[PDB]
Amino acid sequence: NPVERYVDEVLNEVLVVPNINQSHPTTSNAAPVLDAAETGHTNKIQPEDTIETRYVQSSQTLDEMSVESFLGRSGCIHESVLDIVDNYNDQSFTKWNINLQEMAQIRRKFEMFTYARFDSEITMVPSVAAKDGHIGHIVMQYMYVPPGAPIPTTRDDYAWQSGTNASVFWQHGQPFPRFSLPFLSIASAYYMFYDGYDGDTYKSRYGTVVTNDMGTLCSRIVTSEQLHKVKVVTRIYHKAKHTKAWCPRPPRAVQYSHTHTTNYKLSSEVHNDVAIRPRTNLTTV
Amino acid sequence: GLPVYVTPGSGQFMTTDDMQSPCALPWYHPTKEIFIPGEVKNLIEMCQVDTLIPINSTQSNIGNVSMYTVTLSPQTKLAEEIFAIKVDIASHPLATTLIGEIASYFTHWTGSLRFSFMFCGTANTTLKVLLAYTPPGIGKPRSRKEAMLGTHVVWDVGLQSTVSLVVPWISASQYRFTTPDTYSSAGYITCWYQTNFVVPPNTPNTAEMLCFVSGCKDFCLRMARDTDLHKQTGPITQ
């Protein structure tokens, strides 16, 4: 029933976990506790097989552990800065090559899978710092420039006309801008990892930089030069929607160093580079 | 609460919007409506009524009833021109007629125009005149021969004092601009002596003619706009 399923959604009881059944003492030549990890399979033994369990009705649900839930939280992916210091024409606009590689928190979650397909919800949080006292009337323009489209080189570049590109105009005092983007790849899923190159020579590029071009985000303060200088910082947040993921993998164990690459740095004392905490010995809890 | 998305335009005030608003006088019951003769429901009703054309509005005539009359008299030369004006409904001298004034409250017009003329000489005064409409794409006719090649009516003065010439809608586009625009200038209407003004002896040798204008069944105006036939250059006080 689309109404019974509705109730399960509100109560978050779509994916229930199995109950524990009562078990009894056993004496058999069937030894579930014994197996062979060499097979590459996990022993499917359950608590009822190793101890005498009581009957217990499980009420836990796995809804929150779903992929949609795990990757469905909006996190920061970029912090754009427009700092008016001494030249309005040069400092009132900027650009960013879009990617989800610059902020560790969301990057690590997505990288727990090899491939992922999803639509994106982008939410922007602009904050205007009054360096000289006033902020005046701040109006911002955020333009999505897909690869190939002309990139503005001045604050009055014709490209800002946005005759085809999508632009979002925000006015200080109005709610935070937000829009959705459909799965953008030319492939069936996004590559979280890519063991390939864009050629076959010693100078060919390696990794996701080869497959993950998302274009550029061009910003500018629409308002013309004002007496008082401001510093506008626009933080970009991303949330995956209608998500699918494939081939889970080991979580990032060391700090990230660069975008689109798994490269890392190691110090002289490696235990400082990983979350593992040195044990005094094998028997010290 | 219900999630909503405030759309662009919100909070603005557009003078031509059509929204609802709370009533400042709740429970108030308006005066009963009574029957009043003369109700008007559409301005077209006013465009269909003839009003006089101040066709003789030369500087010396403006401010006088004579600005509405055209004088006729015995001619010594044949086929003389009597008058000539543009057909454009909001151009001068048509501008201040009722249909011209209403047309000046709109940007576009279409349809056929009805021009009428009433002879006002004595009952023994005879005359035949040629009223012609010259469609655009050419200058105004310089002679009667040139004019009669277009749309026209030969008017014979008699017991019935008035004649009507219809200026059919002959245009490339479905509508024309009401304000003086080259591309959509509708043409001319000229008047010429077909024979001559003739009277018996002891009868006035001149006579007047009145000119009217109104719209035919296909007349129509479009795109409301403010008029340029009236202005305010200072405060209107008490």
Binding site: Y6, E9, V10, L11, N12 | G1, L2, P3
Partner: peptide, 29 residues
Amino acid sequence: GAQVSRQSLNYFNINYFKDAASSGASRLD
């Protein structure tokens, strides 16, 4: 969700969000 009742006095108990915690005060009894 809309728990539409009928009697005509129709009752529209609407739940705008998808989590139980989001709804308003509970009914009594």
